[PDB]
Design an enzyme around this catalytic site. Structure first.
Site, PDB file in Angstrom:
ATOM      1  N   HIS A 166       0.803  -1.242   0.000  1.00 28.10           N
ATOM      2  CA  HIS A 166       0.000   0.000   0.000  1.00 28.10           C
ATOM      3  C   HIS A 166       0.830   1.284   0.000  1.00 28.10           C
ATOM      4  CE1 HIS A 166      -3.980  -2.184   1.346  1.00 28.10           C
ATOM      5  NE2 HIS A 166      -3.568  -2.548   0.140  1.00 28.10           N
ATOM      6  N   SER A 207      -0.774  -0.755  -6.247  1.00 26.60           N
ATOM      7  CA  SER A 207      -0.561  -1.870  -7.156  1.00 26.60           C
ATOM      8  C   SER A 207       0.249  -1.444  -8.402  1.00 26.60           C
ATOM      9  CB  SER A 207      -1.924  -2.489  -7.569  1.00 26.60           C
ATOM     10  OG  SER A 207      -2.341  -3.534  -6.660  1.00 26.60           O
ATOM     11  N   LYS A 234     -15.194  -6.989  -8.411  1.00 31.27           N
ATOM     12  CA  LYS A 234     -14.294  -7.846  -9.194  1.00 31.27           C
ATOM     13  C   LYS A 234     -13.714  -8.975  -8.340  1.00 31.27           C
ATOM     14  CE  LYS A 234     -11.911  -6.880 -13.520  1.00 31.27           C
ATOM     15  NZ  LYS A 234     -10.480  -6.637 -13.761  1.00 31.27           N
ATOM     16  N   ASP A 235     -13.472  -8.701  -7.051  1.00 29.78           N
ATOM     17  CA  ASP A 235     -12.996  -9.740  -6.125  1.00 29.78           C
ATOM     18  C   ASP A 235     -14.137 -10.675  -5.667  1.00 29.78           C
ATOM     19  OD1 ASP A 235     -10.442  -8.588  -6.549  1.00 29.78           O
ATOM     20  OD2 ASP A 235     -10.092  -7.995  -4.480  1.00 29.78           O
ATOM     21  N   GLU A 276       2.282 -34.442  -3.518  1.00 33.04           N
ATOM     22  CA  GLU A 276       1.130 -33.725  -4.035  1.00 33.04           C
ATOM     23  C   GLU A 276       1.662 -32.793  -5.142  1.00 33.04           C
ATOM     24  OE1 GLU A 276      -2.233 -33.750  -3.324  1.00 33.04           O
ATOM     25  OE2 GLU A 276      -1.972 -35.439  -1.928  1.00 33.04           O
TER      26      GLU A 276
END
Ligand SMILES: CCCCCCCCCCCCCCCCCC(=O)OC[C@H](COP(=O)([O-])OCC(O)COP(=O)([O-])OC[C@@H](COC(=O)CCCCCCCCCCCCCCCCC)OC(=O)CCCCCCCCCCCCCCCCC)OC(=O)CCCCCCCCCCCCCCCCC
Ligand SMILES: CCCCCCCCCCCCCCCCCC(=O)OC[C@H](COP(=O)([O-])OCC(O)COP(=O)([O-])OC[C@@H](COC(=O)CCCCCCCCCCCCCCCCC)OC(=O)CCCCCCCCCCCCCCCCC)OC(=O)CCCCCCCCCCCCCCCCC
Ligand SMILES: CCCCCCCCCCCCCCCCC[C@@H](O)O[C@H](CO[C@H](O)CCCCCCCCCCCCCCC)COP(=O)(O)OCC[N+](C)(C)C
Ligand SMILES: CCCCCCCC/C=C\CCCCCCCC(=O)OC[C@H](COP(=O)(O)OCCN)OC(=O)CCCCCCC/C=C\CCCCCCCC
Ligand SMILES: CCCCCCCC/C=C\CCCCCCCC(=O)OC[C@H](COP(=O)(O)OCCN)OC(=O)CCCCCCC/C=C\CCCCCCCC
Ligand code: HEC
Ligand code: HEC
Ligand code: HEC
Ligand code: HEC
Ligand SMILES: CO/C(=C/C(N)=O)[C@H](C)[C@H](/C=C/c1csc(-c2csc([C@@H](C)/C=C/C=C/C(C)C)n2)n1)OC
Lengths: 241, 75, 67, 61, 49, 378, 54, 54
Positions: F200, F204, F226-227, F270
């Site tokens: 922050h 971004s 959007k999230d 895995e």
């Protein structure tokens, strides 16, 4: 030898992309464990109460439970007594310890049968292929007579003698007890005695798909309308002079 | 952290926006979207696809060379 | 007495194009391991090849009229 | 559908956030009933008789 | 000079109930908010389940 | 004035999740950051509800896990939600690191190095995680990995025995691994909030790699919604994997209780460890094997020192794009090979891909950037 | 809260899980405790403000 | 361990068998109530000194 052969893909009534277990055949397969594989094969994780609502009713399950002696907890005297089977009892342990399985079952150790269609690659198709696909030894290689022969077995030889021959019981409600039938039912039972939730997950999975089919276009529509203020915005640059 | 009114200096740019209630969420969804999606694909196929083909063929050969090795042919 | 669907439809499986072909190379392996002195070029291989072609067909039809 | 059903749904229920909420919670209860068994009925058809719910009467006292 | 600034034509994006320049938007505001709020109400109802 | 801006708790939330100046043009590739946060929380809520019915001892470890699935109401979903969420958490980690490379996000030094530490920690978590059921793969996978630490020169054996609580992966190790697997997701969360702090401080990055200060939009409603949409897709991908194919990614050996004598034919990680397993198995030497496995991940801490390009992003960099997808396809190779035995076609190409991973990051992509600069006369 | 009709098998293990997590939640709530506090600084024995002698 | 069968015994195992486990065990048990004396001092001080006004 080390080189392998894999199971085909027998079209089970539950390995369909959304379809439940055949409840009539989970029933038949329990018997195929009950007086055949109960004498060398543990099923420590399946109790009698589990059979209720699935294959048998409340009475039928209690009736099947009462059929054998269970070592019950110490009395007042201080010694362990033996009582008839209750609904909350585990499936009978044939050997006290897996070392007794070694000495009293032709050298080799038979594995636990709960979770069997999930611990072998290919699953039930493999167990069906091992059970049904029994054949005579090939040329060049001699089976040591304390071990049998199966093509589906990884090492080709080793251990198990096969009781999948025509009619080891007559099926309760009008059914021919053939080789392919008697092998199918155990597998259709062992699926349930590995993944009981099978039907529920698939029932929930349908609801999930129907929910998402309603929800995914609707959230997208919510996003688009909010984003539309930006997606139709027009810029213009007006520098001076 | 930074906030609006302190980010940077910008002069002479008009922006015209519309309310979402005045406009449609999917203006020309298939009549513009499909032309766009192929255009987007054509832009990148020569840059993303060639290593994946190269992997795929190494995968298919490698597995075919694995099995066709331990079996014999003479004594 | 007792009509097993496996061996009834297994006869249709053994009688298939790619199936007999895999028995031909099994037999030519048979009449070479049996024919020679004391080899180790054994036929566990060709056995599995036949059962590959055969049991593929078995699965397609087996479950059609099983109660 | 005279001044549109969506218009009358807005003026009657959607306007105030209170009646908007009340419509959702009343709607969530109605929808839960019509969907739970409504999707169970579709789950019935793909498993026509292979479920224990269909077998039931075969073993009855 | 600022008097040259007309807003670009939006016909391409406009919901059909408000494409007519001679038609009052108020006539269709109710129905238009209705749709987008119904989508939301239905969404929450689905999420609630 | 505004309650949402000046309250010493709501203010901190406002400046992180509401009024945050975000770029107008961030891809669906920027969704994985929040999707990781969802994954982390999802693992906590399934994890706890699993920890309520699970036992830590050899005698009851395997049985309690079964008890959950069979007896505990809706325990089977919680169990598979966890198991599948674990790898869902890995697909997001892989998308997220990949995006960082492609888009030059790594140039944010502190926030990126914290992310590497997040990766090591989430992987240290999952490795301790899979041991808990006490299946065959749980034990022998635990055995194969720990034994590697015997190679560290003078300090070798004392270290492995200290992590063991004995001379093998025993009774002590199960319970000990449980304690560490309980705590680590909380430390993860704390490190993830610092990750978000350092982030922050710049805001971004975006697909172009040019600064977006000239076109910032508020995180709400644009990225809230959007999230929200992106999380719905995650639940779809996680729930299709849980309600239709709960063991597709799972190894069947883990469905038989641990036997410290009988060792299985294949030792299969895995999927999320397969590329790394490959890199490790390829090198014959003991010391070198572990140091290459270590290097396979700590390499991401070098990538910023090896930014050579005048541009930030790969968006306008064609040669670098090809070299990137070569890295992805090469990682796809390491994956597939990791899930294969160390026989003929697989030794060679597995060793080859290993050299390529390192030559690609350490040499090839740093050269592409120098050439790409020169072609623009920069 | 019991996982049954008495303080049983379920309850022990369940209580363990809650006893593992709660000290971490405690720590998180303790840092907010310190946040709200630093917004004024400490009180002192007199109850008069100490801004004149910090 | 978290099960009825081994809960009591693992606690003993710590004290008796685990190296310096007895100190860790009692450090915990006593720290628990030491944590309480501090809680009580701290709340008490808050009342006395009017700190609660925050
Ligand atoms: C079959 C299923 C097809 C699936 C493809 C989905 C791809 C997205 C696509 O729909 O939009 C591109 C495209 C529009 O392109 P565009 O005009 O350049 O739009 C501008 C941007 O792309 C702007 O596009 P956007 O903002 O509408 O989409 C962005 C994105 C992507 O949106 C989602 O994919 C859409 C959700 C699907 C809902 C559909 C309901 C299906 C039931 O949304 C989110 O950010 C998702 C992030 C999630 C990350 C994934 C993590 C999972 C783990 O739409 C295509 O036309 C649709 C595909 C054609 C299908 C033909 C069959 C006819 C019916
Ligand atoms: C591993 C799992 C792989 C599966 C993908 C998981 C979803 C990834 C998601 O995070 O990103 C959402 C992302 C949408 O994000 P966005 O915010 O609109 O930004 C665009 C990209 O980030 C930046 O990419 P771009 O702006 O350079 O455009 C890429 C565009 C992506 O455009 C659409 O999303 C594709 C919608 C078509 C559906 C195709 C269904 C596949 C059958 O087109 C694709 O290259 C191929 C479209 C395939 C249609 C042509 C084939 C004929 C049929 O969509 C996926 O990348 C599409 C995957 C395409 C694979 C199809 C390969 C076919 C050959
Ligand atoms: C965190 C991990 C979980 C992952 C979850 C991911 C999956 C996505 C789901 C997340 C939830 C998102 C919800 C979808 C967003 C829709 C927006 C919604 O919240 O509506 C808002 C407002 O909220 C609703 O109005 C509140 C309705 C309340 C309905 C009840 C919800 C069910 C809870 C039950 C309550 C009882 C309590 C329980 C007691 C035990 C704003 O509405 P808006 O689109 O701007 O319309 C404006 C309103 N108008 C029409 C009046 C102008
Ligand atoms: C806290 C955060 C949790 C909030 C979750 C928000 C919801 C996310 C939306 C994603 C959509 C999911 C698809 C919908 C599928 C669902 O509807 O199918 C129903 C089906 C039940 O059907 P029946 O067995 O017939 O029911 C019998 C009783 N009537 O339920 C599904 O299995 C569940 C869907 C799983 C979605 C996963 C959501 C992820 C969040 C998990 C966190 C869980 C937190 C809960 C702990 C609360 C503490 C008390
Ligand atoms: C590690 C595990 C390895 C497993 C490999 C996974 C299998 C491969 C799946 C890859 C899916 C790729 C989707 C295709 C989309 C893409 O190719 O389109 C190109 C397109 C070009 O767009 P722009 O440059 O912004 O220009 C747009 C102008 N309009 O989009 C982006 O470049 C794609 C962004 C890359 C993100 C990374 C995704 C790759 C996933 C693999 C993980 C990366 C490995 C990370 C290394 C970890 C090592 C510890
Ligand atoms: C009744 C129809 C059954 C079923 C379904 C199975 N068995 Fe047996 N079995 C026995 C022994 C000694 C072995 C060990 C052989 C070896 O070393 O592998 C086995 C093996 C199995 C398996 C495991 C094979 C595999 O899938 O890899 C399975 C799935 C299995 N059995 C199922 C001994 C007996 C026995 C007493 C001699 C009887 C009766 C059964 N088996 C019957 C059954
Ligand atoms: C070193 C690799 C790395 C890993 C692993 C990583 N991060 Fe990040 N993360 C970054 C970088 C760099 C950015 C900056 C991306 C940007 O803005 O383009 C970032 C961005 C984000 C964002 C903001 C949204 C976005 O995607 O840009 C969030 C949230 C996030 N990280 C959280 C997490 C979580 C949670 C984890 C898992 C514990 C994690 N990250 C793992 C390096 C990574
Ligand atoms: C409601 C009672 C209450 C409890 C219980 C309490 N706090 Fe406080 N705490 C306060 C108040 C009020 C102050 C302000 C004291 C002052 O400055 O005079 C404070 C002050 C403090 C301080 C600053 C130093 C000091 O003593 O003034 C710290 C640190 C602290 N709290 C941490 C904790 C921790 C850790 C806990 C245990 C989880 C806790 N507190 C329990 C109410 C309490
Ligand atoms: C509340 C403590 C707790 C947290 C938090 C936690 N888990 Fe677990 N996890 C468990 C327990 C207990 C098991 C064993 C039961 C089981 O296998 O389902 C386990 C199982 C696992 C397994 C084995 C899956 C299987 O069933 O095959 C993996 C892998 C795993 N966790 C990874 C993770 C990851 C990654 C995180 C997030 C960083 C995490 N877990 C969060 C307690 C936790
Ligand atoms: C427990 O065993 C397994 C777990 C699993 N989830 O696949 C596999 C079956 C196993 C593991 C493979 C594997 C490959 S690679 C890896 C691993 C574990 S740990 C690690 C490093 C990078 C992380 C170190 C973190 C250190 C911090 C504590 C500072 N890498 N494990 O296969 C042998």
């Amino acid at each position: 030898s080390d080189l392998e052969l894999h199971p085909p893909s027998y079209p089970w009534s539950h390995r369909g992309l959304l379809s439940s277990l055949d409840h009539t055949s989970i029933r038949r397969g329990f018997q195929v464990y009950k007086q055949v594989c109960s004498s060398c094969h543990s099923m420590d994780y399946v109790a009698y109460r589990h059979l209720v609502g699935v294959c048998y009713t409340e009475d039928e399950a209690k009736a099947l439970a009462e059929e054998v002696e269970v070592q019950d907890g110490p009395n007042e005297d201080g010694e362990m007594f033996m009582r008839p089977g209750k609904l909350s009892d585990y499936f009978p342990k044939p050997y006290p310890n897996p070392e007794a399985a070694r000495a009293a079952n032709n050298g080799a150790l038979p594995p636990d049968l709960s979770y069997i269609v999930r611990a072998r690659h290919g699953g039930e198709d493999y167990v069906f292929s091992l059970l049904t696909g029994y054949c005579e030894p090939p040329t060049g290689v001699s089976l040591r007579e304390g071990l049998y022969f199966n093509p589906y077995f990884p090492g080709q030889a080793i251990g198990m003698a096969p009781p999948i021959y025509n009619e080891v019981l007559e099926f309760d409600d009008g059914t021919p007890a053939t080789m392919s039938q008697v092998a199918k039912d155990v597998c259709t039972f062992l699926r349930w005695a590995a993944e009981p939730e099978h039907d529920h997950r698939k029932r929930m999975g349908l609801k999930m798909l129907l929910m998402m089919g309603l929800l995914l276009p609707l959230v997208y529509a919510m996003k688009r309308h909010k984003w539309s203020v930006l997606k139709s915005r027009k810029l213009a640059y007006r520098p001076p002079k | 952290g930074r906030q609006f009114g302190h980010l940077t200096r910008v002069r002479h740019v008009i922006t015209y926006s519309l309310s979402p209630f005045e406009q449609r969420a999917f203006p020309h969804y298939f009549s513009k979207g499909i032309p766009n999606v192929l255009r987007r694909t054509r832009a990148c196929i020569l840059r993303v696809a060639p290593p994946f083909v190269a992997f795929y063929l190494v995968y298919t050969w490698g597995t075919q060379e694995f099995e066709k090795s331990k079996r014999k042919n003479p004594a | 007495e007792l009509v097993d669907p496996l061996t009834t439809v297994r006869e249709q499986c053994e009688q298939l194009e790619k199936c007999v072909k895999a028995r031909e190379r099994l037999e030519l392996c048979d009449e070479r391991v049996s024919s020679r002195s004391q080899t180790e070029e054994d036929c566990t291989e060709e056995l599995l090849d036949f059962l590959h072609a055969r049991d593929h067909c078995v699965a397609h039809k087996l479950f059609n009229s099983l109660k | 559908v005279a001044p549109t059903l969506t218009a009358r749904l807005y003026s009657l229920l959607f306007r105030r956030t209170s009646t908007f909420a009340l419509t959702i919670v009343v709607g969530a209860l109605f929808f839960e009933r019509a969907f739970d068994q409504g999707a169970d009925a579709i789950y019935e058809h793909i498993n026509e008789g292979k479920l224990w719910k269909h077998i039931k009467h075969k073993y009855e006292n | 000079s600022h008097t040259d600034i007309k807003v670009p034509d939006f016909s391409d994006y406009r919901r059909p109930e408000v494409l007519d320049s001679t038609k009052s938007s108020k006539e269709s505001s109710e129905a238009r908010k209705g749709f987008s709020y119904l989508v939301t109400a239905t969404t929450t109802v689905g999420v609630a389940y | 004035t505004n309650i949402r801006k000046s309250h010493p708790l709501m203010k901190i939330v406002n400046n992180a999740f509401i009024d945050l100046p975000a770029p107008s043009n961030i891809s669906s590739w920027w969704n994985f950051g929040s999707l990781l946060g969802i994954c982390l929380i999802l693992q906590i809520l399934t994890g706890l509800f699993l920890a309520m019915h699970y036992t830590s001892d050899t005698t009851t470890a395997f049985s309690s896990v079964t008890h959950i699935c069979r007896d505990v109401n809706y325990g089977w979903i919680i169990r598979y939600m966890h198991a599948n969420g674990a790898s869902m958490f890995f697909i997001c980690l892989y998308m997220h690191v990949g995006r960082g490379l492609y888009y030059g996000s790594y140039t944010f030094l502190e926030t990126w190095n914290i992310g590497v530490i997040l990766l090591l920690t989430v992987m240290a978590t999952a490795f301790m995680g899979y041991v808990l059921p006490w299946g065959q793969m749980s034990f022998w996978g635990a055995t194969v990995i720990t034994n590697l630490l015997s190679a560290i020169p003078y300090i070798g054996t004392n270290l492995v025995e200290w992590i063991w609580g004995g001379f093998s992966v025993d009774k002590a190790t199960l319970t000990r691994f449980f304690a560490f697997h309980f705590i680590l997701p909380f430390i993860i969360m704390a490190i993830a909030m610092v990750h978000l702090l350092f982030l922050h401080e710049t805001g971004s990055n975006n697909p172009t790699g040019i600064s977006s200060d000239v076109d910032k939009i508020p995180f709400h409603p644009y990225y809230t919604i959007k999230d929200i949409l992106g999380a719905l897709l995650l639940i779809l991908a996680l729930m299709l994997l849980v309600l239709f194919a709960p063991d597709l990614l799972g190894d069947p050996d883990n469905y038989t209780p641990a036997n410290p004598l009988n060792t299985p034919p294949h030792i299969k990680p895995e999927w999320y460890f397969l590329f790394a397993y490959a890199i490790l198995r390829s090198i014959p030497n003991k010391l070198g094997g572990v140091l290459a496995l270590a290097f396979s991940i700590l390499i991401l801490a070098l990538i910023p020192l090896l930014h050579t390009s005048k541009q930030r992003s790969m968006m306008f960099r064609p040669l670098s794009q090809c070299l990137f997808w070569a890295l992805v396809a090469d990682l796809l190779t390491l994956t597939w090979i990791g899930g294969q035995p160390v026989e003929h076609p697989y030794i060679t190409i597995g060793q080859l891909a290993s050299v390529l991973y390192f030559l690609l990051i350490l040499v090839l992509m740093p050269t592409a950037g120098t050439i790409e600069n020169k072609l623009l006369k920069w």
